[PDB]
């Protein structure tokens, strides 16, 4: 292989690896914030569904 | 053959033969025998080979590397720029090693050429050797086996900081 092919092949390798490293660091930061704040799609632990509630008039009025 | 400026030699001064004896010089007759029996047949063989080379003449070139931005112009962790800057620094490092080798070869050739007068007559080669070694040492010495442009720069800035402080106190 000529030196230009290897040289520019190296740049393509470096770009991919560098981009993956940045994404890996963001994921650790995103995961830290989602877990601490619970304001994202991850670490979304279930709560009771409100469509299970009966809204019709009950046998007695105070409720 | 080679660039005479890069690899200088002085003008040769041979003394003409001045015999003071009647005996024949055996070296003179051996030189004639060597020229006839050794050099002449050797020259004929080379001239034949030189004819064949002329029939098939082709070229090769010296690779020229475009200058690229150096490590000082690279943003931190920007690997694409650091890579080109780092490969360039390595190429220059290999070139500076050969520059010191050229100067060392001048010094060594002068010492042999000047004979017993070498201490006086080789001063300029010695002084030039001393300077290029000093410059080479400043650039590259103590960087370690994992040297890089980044470490070279860190060393330079340390030297520059000591130079600025010394002048400040002066």
From Swiss-Prot, chain A:
One of its GO terms (cellular component) is respiratory chain complex I. Disulfide bonds: none annotated. The keyword 4Fe-4S does not apply. Keywords: Electron transport, Membrane, Mitochondrion, Mitochondrion inner membrane, Respiratory chain, Transit peptide, Transmembrane, Transmembrane helix, Transport. It is found in: Mitochondrion inner membrane. Its main location: mitochondrion. Coiled coil: none annotated. Belongs to the complex I NDUFB5 subunit family. Accessory subunit of the mitochondrial membrane respiratory chain NADH dehydrogenase (Complex I), that is believed not to be involved in catalysis. Complex I functions in the transfer of electrons from NADH to the respiratory chain. The immediate electron acceptor for the enzyme is believed to be ubiquinone. Complex I is composed of 45 different subunits. This is NADH dehydrogenase [ubiquinone] 1 beta subcomplex subunit 5, mitochondrial. The lineage of its organism: Eukaryota, Metazoa, Chordata, Craniata, Vertebrata. The gene is NDUFB5. The chain holds residues 127 to 189 of 189 of the full protein.
From Swiss-Prot, chain B:
Residues 1-24 are annotated as: Disordered. Residues 1-12 have a biased composition (Basic and acidic residues). Keywords: Electron transport, Membrane, Mitochondrion, Mitochondrion inner membrane, Phosphoprotein, Respiratory chain, Transport. One of its GO terms (cellular component) is mitochondrial inner membrane. It is found in: Mitochondrion inner membrane. It is a peripheral membrane protein. It holds the Pfam family NDUFB10. The modification Phosphoserine is found at residue 148. PANTHER family: NADH DEHYDROGENASE [UBIQUINONE] 1 BETA SUBCOMPLEX SUBUNIT 10, NADH-UBIQUINONE OXIDOREDUCTASE PDSW SUBUNIT. Complex I is composed of 45 different subunits. Interacts with CHCHD4. Belongs to the complex I NDUFB10 subunit family. Accessory subunit that is involved in the functional assembly of the mitochondrial respiratory chain complex I. Complex I has an NADH dehydrogenase activity with ubiquinone as an immediate electron acceptor and mediates the transfer of electrons from NADH to the respiratory chain. This is NADH dehydrogenase [ubiquinone] 1 beta subcomplex subunit 10. The lineage of its organism: Eukaryota, Metazoa, Chordata, Craniata, Vertebrata.
